[PDB]
């Protein structure tokens, strides 16, 4: 699916100590098309899920990316 998948990634972030609040800031920065600054933790978690991230990188319409933006936003609360 996508909501099921997205959760896996929020999980890692938290399980890997990644401050998920910041992770959201970069996912916004990434999709908008703004200068990003991932942490070592966060950046390697993402490349697993968005393979072509170096080049193509988290689109607006990428389903999983949209889901993950929410899947995080909720968890922040």
């Amino acid at each position: 699916g996508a909501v099921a998948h997205a959760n896996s990634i929020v999980q890692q972030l938290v399980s890997e100590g990644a401050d998920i609040s910041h992770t959201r800031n970069m996912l916004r920065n990434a999709m908008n098309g703004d200068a990003v600054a991932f942490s070592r933790v966060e950046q390697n978690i993402f490349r697993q899920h968005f393979p072509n991230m170096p080049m193509h990188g988290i689109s607006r319409d990428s389903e999983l990316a949209i889901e993950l933006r929410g899947a995080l936003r909720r968890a922040v609360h």
Partner: protein, 288 residues
């Protein structure tokens, strides 16, 4: 700190022009009649401090015609605004796609003036151990006679050995322009900017002010793309806009030959922003 070109509290905000990563931007006329740009960074002070500072120190050397020149700053009452010359024409992208802007488009010349212009911009910064790390069409504002000026240094870094620095820090920049080598390895050099320039280069040729567009095929990364064309598969003249038969067959084979040279898999095989600035002019020469 070491500075005192520091202005203090103007008027109340007339909602205008821009919006930024950490901050907003407003067009505010000064007491002396000067048209000035204001990059207020009070929205989300999410480490918007270190960037703000680096942009004060790295830019208080404001001595160039191809860089946006900073007038003043303000750290008064938690706020942290930055002051610059208002740029009549906005960024370069707004002239390569974006939306609107009458009188059709830019010429090939006007495109080359702005390609060469921008190059001195970087070359200079590479002369001064400065990596910009965030070179892109949006960061290349233009003024009244369409003269290129670099901006948003916030992400930038400075080197020790003055030029030959092959230092390493946290990865930063715009997802499509980032040096892949830089990304995959972490080792940051001045060439990572050369790569980013190669990207803009085509982004001028093609007008695919998309660089990375997630809708056509596996032809998504204009960097990966124009490379597969002009590096081998076709020297494609099909990649550009209604630029017409305006470009000479020879200047075009150079303009790209370089832009491709900028995007080499390793920084190793890239040209220093010196060559790139020479080759650029050379093609503008090749054309007329």
């Amino acid at each position: 700190l070491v500075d005192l070109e520091e202005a203090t509290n103007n008027f109340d905000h007339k909602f205008l022009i821009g919006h930024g990563v950490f901050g907003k931007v407003y067009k505010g006329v000064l007491r002396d009649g000067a048209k000035v740009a204001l990059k207020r960074r009070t929205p989300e002070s999410s480490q918007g401090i270190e960037e703000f500072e680096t942009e004060i120190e790295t830019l208080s050397f404001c001595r160039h015609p191809h860089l946006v020149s900073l007038i003043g700053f303000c750290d008064e009452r938690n706020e942290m605004i930055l002051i610059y010359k208002y740029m009549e024409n906005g960024n370069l992208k707004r002239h390569l796609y974006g939306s609107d802007l009458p009188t059709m488009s830019m010429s090939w010349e006007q495109r080359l003036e702005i390609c060469i212009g921008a190059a001195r911009g970087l070359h200079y910064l590479h002369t001064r151990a400065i990596i910009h790390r965030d070179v892109k069409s949006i960061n290349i504002l233009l003024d009244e006679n369409f003269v290129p000026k670099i901006t948003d240094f916030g992400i930038s870094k400075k080197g020790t050995e003055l030029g030959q620095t092959h230092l390493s820090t946290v990865v930063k920049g715009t997802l499509g322009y980032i040096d892949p080598e830089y990304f995959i390895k972490g080792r940051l050099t001045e060439k990572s900017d050369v790569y980013s320039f190669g990207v803009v280069l085509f982004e001028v040729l093609c007008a695919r002010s998309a660089i990375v567009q997630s809708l056509p095929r596996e032809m998504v990364n204009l960097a990966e793309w124009a490379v597969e064309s002009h590096n081998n598969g076709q020297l494609e003249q099909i990649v550009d806009p209604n630029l017409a038969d305006k470009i000479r067959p020879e200047s075009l084979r150079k303009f790209g030959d370089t832009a491709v040279k900028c995007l080499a898999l390793s920084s190793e095989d890239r040209p220093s922003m010196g060559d790139v600035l020479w080759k650029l002019e050379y093609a503008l020469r090749l054309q007329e």
